[PDB]
Amino acid sequence: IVGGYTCGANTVPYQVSLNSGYHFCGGSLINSQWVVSAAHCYKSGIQVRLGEDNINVVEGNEQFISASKSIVHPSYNSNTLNNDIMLIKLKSAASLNSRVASISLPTSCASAGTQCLISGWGNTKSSGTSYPDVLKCLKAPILSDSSCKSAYPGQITSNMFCAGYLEGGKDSCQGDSGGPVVCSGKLQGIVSWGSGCAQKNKPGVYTKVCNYVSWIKQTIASN
Numbered sequence: 001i002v003g004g005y006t007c008g009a010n011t012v013p014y015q016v017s018l019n020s021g022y023h024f025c026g027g028s029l030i031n032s033q034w035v036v037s038a039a040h041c042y043k044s045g046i047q048v049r050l051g052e053d054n055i056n057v058v059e060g061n062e063q064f065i066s067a068s069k070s071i072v073h074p075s076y077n078s079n080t081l082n083n084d085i086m087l088i089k090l091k092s093a094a095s096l097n098s099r100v101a102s103i104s105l106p107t108s109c110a111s112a113g114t115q116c117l118i119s120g121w122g123n124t125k126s127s128g129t130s131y132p133d134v135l136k137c138l139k140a141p142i143l144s145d146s147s148c149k150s151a152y153p154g155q156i157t158s159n160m161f162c163a164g165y166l167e168g169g170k171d172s173c174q175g176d177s178g179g180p181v182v183c184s185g186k187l188q189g190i191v192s193w194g195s196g197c198a199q200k201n202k203p204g205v206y207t208k209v210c211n212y213v214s215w216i217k218q219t220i221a222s223n
């Protein structure tokens with residue numbers, strides 16, 4: 001997260017870190033046994049880390065739980081990043097508490113102008129590299145479909161939205177991939193892609209979770 005703020009320990013209790021020997025992606029806990037992330041975060045040997053603030057220090061609220069199964073969206077296209085969503089089942093259920101909590105799926109798609117909270121442990125710089133150890137937050141609005149399409153001609157599908165600032169300076173970035181965009185206490189987006197980070201006229205692009213609720217619910221019901 002470029003241009004964000006330190007969230008504060010366990011203020012974003014649905015935020016997960018996906019760990020393969022190191023943090024590589026974010027995710028959201030949607031019930032005690034399931035995580036949603038980006039399909040571009042897929043790899044084998046995932047440990048889900050819940051209750052994290054500092055990802056390099058054991059602080060006391062963590063739960064570390066191996067993935068048993070990963071399900072990439074059947075229509076994920078790695079070239080276009082259309083359908084950039086995946087589900088991860090935990091080997092055992094998480095213990096839910098005030099610091100580890102699931103985030104609701106949306107009943108409705110959020111409109112342009114809605115203010116959302118984006119969070120992650122990604123890069124905090126738009127050029128060069130500085131990775132924070134503690135969770136970073138950004139408040140950002142959903143942009144109009146027309147702004148988003150103007151910024152990324154020919155690249156925006158009905159399964160994507162833009163959020164952030166056309167002036168630049170504030171965005172998700174490398175390592176934030178798969179993390180949540182939460183609006184009005186519902187998961188609306190997943191950190192998916194962009195042209196660099198925090199560039200002028202190049203806002204972040206997010207997976208539009210409201211299009212995937214039936215797939216998520218039917219997949220969880222049968223796995």
Ligand SMILES: NCCc1c[nH]c2ccccc12
Nearest residue numbers: 172173174192193194196204
């Ligand atoms: N808005 C940030 C999108 C993002 C995801 N993964 C990245 C890797 C490099 C640069 C940007 C990104």
Ligand SMILES: [Ca+2]
Nearest residue numbers: 054057058059
């Ligand atoms: Ca920790």
